[PDB]
Amino acid sequence: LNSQFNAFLTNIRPTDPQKEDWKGGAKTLRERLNNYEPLKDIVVSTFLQGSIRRSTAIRPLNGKRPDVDIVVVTNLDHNQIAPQEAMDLFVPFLEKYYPEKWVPQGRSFGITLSYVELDLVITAIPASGEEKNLLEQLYRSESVLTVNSLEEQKDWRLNKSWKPSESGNSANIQDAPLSEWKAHPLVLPDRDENKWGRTHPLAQIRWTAEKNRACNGHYINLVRAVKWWRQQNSDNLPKYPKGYPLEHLIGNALDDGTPSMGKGLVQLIDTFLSRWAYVYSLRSKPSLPDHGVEEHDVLARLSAEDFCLFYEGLEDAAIIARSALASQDPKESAELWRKLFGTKFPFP
């Protein structure tokens, strides 16, 4: 049935030891930053972001520690201190609590844990005064401070008053109106320069949460499936798009009301081929806006040839996928998927 996709997904998700390591690690990091006295006046919030938070991360090959992105929200005035000087403020904290285990990775700090690799970006709140104070109430809320992932909290709402269900009302509290957060993203260091850029991790999480529910929980699992395909055919595929550029392209192609993984995949693949045919013939790339900062093109760093090589790769995958979804021979159908996904996709 559709159970073959459930076993395959449990095989590509990060393992429970990694899961328990990034939950306690982020919790231990959050308490340390809040209690640390030279940073007891600056740290506003420490929360999990990224594919770990959005349940779009696949387990790495060869037992390498998965990348777990973490945001430290500060109350610093980003107009009076540059990101290097803001990251320099956390150097003593790192030496004391995470000695010989951290490293400055330019835009972010890397913390090597037992099973995971923490990726920390120091961020500041653009707002000020009573407007800043209302945003800090959101970053100190259970909505943001939750260490559970989107697959575990399908009812997740972006709201300072929202509490998670106890599986038995603050849980019924809906997403905060866009006027409170949509145009108020955080700022982080540039990948290369000593200048603040703009990021909106919460908005990306809220779009992913809404898109997941609209696709009957299949959206995050389809992103994991395609990321797995991209890793198992990496020798026939170009180095980009990978990671969030790839995930964003799947959230664009996949349509609302997805009934099954089998029907979800070919649909998003067919739509990727139909939608970008006019852009691929001109040997060009699309310009998709980010769910967080709308004035940002998620594919800004993707080369135009890179995307057209990927478009060619999806066409090769499309032949297998359509055969496997239409094949009614269980010996041929389950074999067909494994040509796309490798051995981790199991038989009936």
Ligand SMILES: Nc1nc2c(ncn2[C@@H]2O[C@H](COP(=O)(O)OP(=O)(O)OP(=O)(O)O)[C@@H](O)[C@H]2O)c(=O)[nH]1
């Ligand atoms: N809008 C936008 N956000 C990005 C982009 N790259 C990274 N991000 C954000 O930064 C977060 C972490 O970056 P990465 O760890 O490099 O991307 P990732 O997909 O989470 O990495 P893995 O899942 O571990 O493979 C992502 O979840 C995004 O929210 C980008 O190109 N555009």
Ligand SMILES: Nc1nc2c(ncn2[C@@H]2O[C@H](COP(=O)(O)OP(=O)(O)OP(=O)(O)O)[C@@H](O)[C@H]2O)c(=O)[nH]1
């Ligand atoms: N929270 C978070 N956001 C990220 C991360 N990495 C990238 N982003 C967001 O994704 C956008 C694209 O990231 P990059 O590809 O590194 O772009 P950049 O070189 O840093 O800056 P520009 O190219 O000038 O926009 C950034 O503007 C960030 O807002 C991350 O690790 N954490």
Ligand SMILES: [Mg+2]
């Ligand atoms: Mg990541």
Ligand SMILES: [Mg+2]
């Ligand atoms: Mg990262």
Ligand SMILES: [Mg+2]
């Ligand atoms: Mg840059």
